[PDB]
Symmetry: C2
Subunit: 149 residues, 2 copies
């Protein structure tokens, strides 16, 4: 097994296939971190702020790490990121951007807000596997995360 | 070979043993990224601002990623971090903290001061090797770094 059962990973991904492929890869590595999924940006913000208008806050723990796609239905990931980095508490949570966008503008803006890192989703299974396996080792095993952020 | 020869890694580390062993691990893995080392906070700032002795941008290109130790001679890492994060251009460079300090205060505050991730220095060569190998894969191969050129 790998990871910490007390450090949730919030994955904001609207593609069911992308999420499923990702989830299965984490399961093959024995990751124990609980995975929470949001499909829209509106859900992501509600979940993080524990607003309770779209998600019950009682079953929405603060994540230790956030995997965020810039492209999302409703409020998009770009707007989610900007809002997050303006909050004294949420801005501390490591945010890893994982999207199909390789646009120089998105990369530049994201890093300007000090995202932790930017990852372009690779199409190839071998490359995606290496990407996810490394993400797991780095974030869930090596790095010291803030107390939930 | 691994990495990109046009994406420099700036390592702010005053420990000769820690730096030299780190560089040797990168060379053993075939990393082609140029490695620039600064030994004090003031020196790192001069390099990043391209002032003082690092007056020629062609000689001191902007690094694509920074590995910083919080403990440094004179202006310490904490002060260096806060300063570059206030600069329009430099704030885009991801900063990875790799230090001996494992105290909650530095960790919480560092994440508050916009770092990408925090890594506590391993004591045994076996774990250090594995840790650095993951650092290499993640930062120099997987992640899309900001365009600092």
């Amino acid at each position: 097994a790998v990871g910490n059962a007390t450090q949730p990973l919030l994955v904001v991904e609207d593609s069911d296939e992308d999420f499923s492929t990702f989830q299965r890869l984490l399961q093959r590595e024995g990751v124990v971190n609980p995975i929470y999924r949001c499909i829209t940006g509106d859900q992501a913000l509600d979940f993080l702020y524990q607003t309770g208008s779209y998600c019950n806050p009682d079953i929405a723990p603060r994540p230790a790490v956030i995997l965020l796609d810039l492209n999302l239905p409703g409020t998009d990931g770009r707007e989610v990121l900007q809002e997050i980095k303006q909050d004294e508490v949420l801005k501390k949570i490591p945010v890893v951007i994982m999207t199909t966008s390789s646009n120089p503008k998105d990369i530049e803006i994201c890093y300007s807000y000090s995202i932790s890192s930017y990852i372009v989703k690779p199409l190839e299974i071998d490359r995606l596997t290496e990407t996810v396996q490394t993400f797991i080792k780095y974030w869930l095993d090596i790095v010291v995360l803030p107390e939930m952020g």
